[PDB]
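Researcher: For the annotation table, I need structure tokens for Spondin-1. Please keep the output clean. Sequence:
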Amino acid sequence: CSRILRAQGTRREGYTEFSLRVEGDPDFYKPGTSYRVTLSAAPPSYFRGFTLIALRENREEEDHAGTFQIIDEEETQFMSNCPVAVTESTPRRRTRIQVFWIAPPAGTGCVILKASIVQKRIIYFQDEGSLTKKLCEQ
């Protein structure tokens, strides 16, 4: 599929009012361990849609680390447009979203989880910042 899935995006680098983080906040990952990933929207702010992927550091095809597992089928789904991505299942307002992610085999290096966010019309995305989480193996 594509990260060219973006054609209507506004790039917004840095820390924003939207945050992608992992519950427990691990400094490092452990191959085959299932971490809970959450996408959050701070004080009087909300989102209506999003996307989510994982990638090995430095890599920009089939270079996606680990696998996602759906927790809330009323909120999330795998995108039939891009199967390696997790996205919203309804454009209804949310302040939180959660998904499982399972750590890739021993010695896969560093992994970045990236999210994009649509609030009203605008789709926001970035390479570095609060919608981005890098996790390494050691």
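Researcher: And a one-line annotation?
Model: The chain has one domain: 1-138.
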